[PDB]
Amino acid sequence: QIITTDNTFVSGNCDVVIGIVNNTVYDPLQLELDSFKE
Amino acid sequence: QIITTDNTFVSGNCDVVIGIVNNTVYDPLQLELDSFKE
Ligand SMILES: *[C@@H]1O[C@H](CO)[C@@H](O[C@@H]2O[C@H](CO)[C@@H](O)[C@H](O)[C@H]2NC(C)=O)[C@H](O)[C@H]1NC(C)=O
Ligand SMILES: *[C@@H]1O[C@H](CO)[C@@H](O[C@@H]2O[C@H](CO)[C@@H](O)[C@H](O)[C@H]2NC(C)=O)[C@H](O)[C@H]1NC(C)=O
């Protein structure tokens, strides 16, 4: 599945988790607002 | 964590539940929309 803000939850910043990897997380709704009135 | 409409669910009116307290549940979508539309 696509990694999104509905499939995942956020807790803290990125400097704590030993194995954290940089990747894009797609935000539903936030993209839509741009289509509605860019 | 902040109490939001994603963390809780809604069922019924504020009368039957014993010991219900008044507070604000923060809906993220409305907050964004009041910025998007201005
Ligand atoms: C994940 O991304 C962050 C930035 O979003 C990277 O940290 C920055 O890396 C640049 C070089 O590309 C530096 O100039 C910045 O000073 C860094 N900032 C911080 C706060 O570290 C981070 O290295 C990336 N991690 C991986 C594994 O790619
Ligand atoms: C939560 O807020 C509601 C109002 O939105 C309160 O309802 C009022 O209660 C007082 C008595 O406490 C009545 O005189 C008002 O007529 C009520 N108004 C409405 C619109 O219901 C409710 O009491 C509050 N609850 C708590 C625990 O503070």
mmCIF file of C-alpha atoms and ligand atoms in Angstrom:
data_model
loop_
_atom_site.group_PDB
_atom_site.id
_atom_site.type_symbol
_atom_site.label_atom_id
_atom_site.label_comp_id
_atom_site.label_asym_id
_atom_site.label_seq_id
_atom_site.Cartn_x
_atom_site.Cartn_y
_atom_site.Cartn_z
ATOM 1 C CA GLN A 1 0.000 0.000 0.000
ATOM 2 C CA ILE A 2 1.058 3.606 -0.435
ATOM 3 C CA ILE A 3 2.475 5.037 2.786
ATOM 4 C CA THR A 4 0.121 7.830 3.867
ATOM 5 C CA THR A 5 -0.864 9.854 6.923
ATOM 6 C CA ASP A 6 -3.875 7.552 7.412
ATOM 7 C CA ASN A 7 -1.873 4.311 7.401
ATOM 8 C CA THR A 8 0.816 5.693 9.742
ATOM 9 C CA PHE A 9 0.998 7.796 12.899
ATOM 10 C CA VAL A 10 3.535 10.445 13.934
ATOM 11 C CA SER A 11 5.443 10.451 17.224
ATOM 12 C CA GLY A 12 8.494 12.668 17.682
ATOM 13 C CA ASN A 13 11.226 13.818 15.326
ATOM 14 C CA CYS A 14 13.608 11.857 13.083
ATOM 15 C CA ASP A 15 16.797 11.980 15.218
ATOM 16 C CA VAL A 16 15.675 9.359 17.786
ATOM 17 C CA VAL A 17 14.818 6.186 15.820
ATOM 18 C CA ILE A 18 18.010 4.265 15.024
ATOM 19 C CA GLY A 19 16.869 2.800 11.693
ATOM 20 C CA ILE A 20 14.699 5.611 10.316
ATOM 21 C CA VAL A 21 14.922 6.049 6.532
ATOM 22 C CA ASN A 22 14.104 9.153 4.502
ATOM 23 C CA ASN A 23 11.116 8.665 2.206
ATOM 24 C CA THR A 24 8.134 10.627 0.966
ATOM 25 C CA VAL A 25 4.852 10.078 2.801
ATOM 26 C CA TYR A 26 1.850 11.057 0.699
ATOM 27 C CA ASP A 27 -0.727 13.190 2.481
ATOM 28 C CA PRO A 28 -4.369 12.673 1.456
ATOM 29 C CA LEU A 29 -6.581 15.789 1.517
ATOM 30 C CA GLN A 30 -3.563 18.119 1.497
ATOM 31 C CA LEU A 31 -3.021 17.337 -2.185
ATOM 32 C CA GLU A 32 -6.731 17.826 -2.899
ATOM 33 C CA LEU A 33 -6.862 21.372 -1.493
ATOM 34 C CA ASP A 34 -4.365 22.383 -4.201
ATOM 35 C CA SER A 35 -6.569 20.985 -6.961
ATOM 36 C CA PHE A 36 -9.591 22.750 -5.457
ATOM 37 C CA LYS A 37 -7.909 26.207 -5.500
ATOM 38 C CA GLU A 38 -4.219 25.992 -6.469
ATOM 39 C CA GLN B 1 -1.878 13.496 22.753
ATOM 40 C CA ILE B 2 -4.192 16.233 21.563
ATOM 41 C CA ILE B 3 -7.820 15.103 21.441
ATOM 42 C CA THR B 4 -8.917 15.251 17.794
ATOM 43 C CA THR B 5 -11.643 13.846 15.566
ATOM 44 C CA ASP B 6 -9.152 11.191 14.384
ATOM 45 C CA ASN B 7 -8.462 9.855 17.895
ATOM 46 C CA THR B 8 -12.097 9.632 19.076
ATOM 47 C CA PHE B 9 -15.446 8.460 17.712
ATOM 48 C CA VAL B 10 -18.893 10.027 18.155
ATOM 49 C CA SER B 11 -22.021 8.252 19.387
ATOM 50 C CA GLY B 12 -25.064 10.031 20.817
ATOM 51 C CA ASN B 13 -25.726 13.374 22.479
ATOM 52 C CA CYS B 14 -24.189 14.836 25.667
ATOM 53 C CA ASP B 15 -26.851 13.680 28.139
ATOM 54 C CA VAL B 16 -26.957 9.919 28.679
ATOM 55 C CA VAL B 17 -23.262 9.446 29.514
ATOM 56 C CA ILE B 18 -22.628 9.779 33.251
ATOM 57 C CA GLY B 19 -19.633 11.942 34.097
ATOM 58 C CA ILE B 20 -19.148 13.530 30.677
ATOM 59 C CA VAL B 21 -17.065 16.723 30.778
ATOM 60 C CA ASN B 22 -16.976 19.753 28.502
ATOM 61 C CA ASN B 23 -13.889 20.293 26.360
ATOM 62 C CA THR B 24 -12.771 21.022 22.809
ATOM 63 C CA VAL B 25 -12.108 18.269 20.277
ATOM 64 C CA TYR B 26 -9.841 19.668 17.573
ATOM 65 C CA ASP B 27 -10.946 18.745 14.068
ATOM 66 C CA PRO B 28 -7.939 19.184 11.729
ATOM 67 C CA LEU B 29 -9.853 19.445 8.459
ATOM 68 C CA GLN B 30 -11.957 22.432 9.538
ATOM 69 C CA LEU B 31 -8.889 24.233 10.846
ATOM 70 C CA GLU B 32 -7.154 23.798 7.502
ATOM 71 C CA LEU B 33 -10.267 24.869 5.563
ATOM 72 C CA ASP B 34 -10.601 28.123 7.529
ATOM 73 C CA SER B 35 -7.055 28.908 6.279
ATOM 74 C CA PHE B 36 -7.555 27.633 2.729
ATOM 75 C CA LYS B 37 -10.701 29.689 2.108
ATOM 76 C CA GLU B 38 -9.941 32.603 4.477
HETATM 77 C C1 LIG C 1 17.031 12.961 5.645
HETATM 78 O O1 LIG C 1 16.779 14.334 5.294
HETATM 79 C C2 LIG C 1 17.461 15.288 6.125
HETATM 80 C C3 LIG C 1 17.030 16.657 5.656
HETATM 81 O O2 LIG C 1 15.645 16.684 5.336
HETATM 82 C C4 LIG C 1 18.968 15.067 6.023
HETATM 83 O O3 LIG C 1 19.659 15.974 6.877
HETATM 84 C C5 LIG C 1 20.233 17.095 6.161
HETATM 85 O O4 LIG C 1 21.127 16.693 5.092
HETATM 86 C C6 LIG C 1 21.689 17.801 4.371
HETATM 87 C C7 LIG C 1 22.521 17.218 3.253
HETATM 88 O O5 LIG C 1 21.699 16.637 2.250
HETATM 89 C C8 LIG C 1 22.497 18.678 5.327
HETATM 90 O O6 LIG C 1 23.021 19.794 4.616
HETATM 91 C C9 LIG C 1 21.594 19.154 6.456
HETATM 92 O O7 LIG C 1 22.341 19.935 7.382
HETATM 93 C C10 LIG C 1 20.997 17.950 7.167
HETATM 94 N N1 LIG C 1 20.131 18.375 8.256
HETATM 95 C C11 LIG C 1 19.944 17.654 9.365
HETATM 96 C C12 LIG C 1 19.017 18.245 10.384
HETATM 97 O O8 LIG C 1 20.494 16.570 9.538
HETATM 98 C C13 LIG C 1 19.290 13.638 6.431
HETATM 99 O O9 LIG C 1 20.685 13.395 6.301
HETATM 100 C C14 LIG C 1 18.524 12.674 5.541
HETATM 101 N N2 LIG C 1 18.820 11.299 5.908
HETATM 102 C C15 LIG C 1 19.119 10.342 5.021
HETATM 103 C C16 LIG C 1 19.397 8.985 5.593
HETATM 104 O O10 LIG C 1 19.162 10.561 3.814
HETATM 105 C C1 LIG C 2 -21.308 22.114 28.793
HETATM 106 O O1 LIG C 2 -21.760 23.231 28.005
HETATM 107 C C2 LIG C 2 -23.188 23.304 27.865
HETATM 108 C C3 LIG C 2 -23.475 24.486 26.971
HETATM 109 O O2 LIG C 2 -22.969 24.282 25.659
HETATM 110 C C4 LIG C 2 -23.834 23.426 29.244
HETATM 111 O O3 LIG C 2 -25.250 23.441 29.099
HETATM 112 C C5 LIG C 2 -25.781 24.529 29.879
HETATM 113 O O4 LIG C 2 -25.872 24.177 31.281
HETATM 114 C C6 LIG C 2 -26.400 25.221 32.116
HETATM 115 C C7 LIG C 2 -26.377 24.697 33.533
HETATM 116 O O5 LIG C 2 -25.109 24.149 33.864
HETATM 117 C C8 LIG C 2 -27.801 25.601 31.644
HETATM 118 O O6 LIG C 2 -28.292 26.672 32.443
HETATM 119 C C9 LIG C 2 -27.747 26.023 30.184
HETATM 120 O O7 LIG C 2 -29.054 26.338 29.717
HETATM 121 C C10 LIG C 2 -27.167 24.890 29.352
HETATM 122 N N1 LIG C 2 -27.113 25.262 27.947
HETATM 123 C C11 LIG C 2 -27.235 24.378 26.951
HETATM 124 C C12 LIG C 2 -27.157 24.937 25.563
HETATM 125 O O8 LIG C 2 -27.397 23.179 27.161
HETATM 126 C C13 LIG C 2 -23.408 22.247 30.107
HETATM 127 O O9 LIG C 2 -23.958 22.371 31.413
HETATM 128 C C14 LIG C 2 -21.892 22.212 30.194
HETATM 129 N N2 LIG C 2 -21.453 21.097 31.021
HETATM 130 C C15 LIG C 2 -20.506 21.200 31.958
HETATM 131 C C16 LIG C 2 -20.186 19.941 32.706
HETATM 132 O O10 LIG C 2 -19.932 22.258 32.194
#
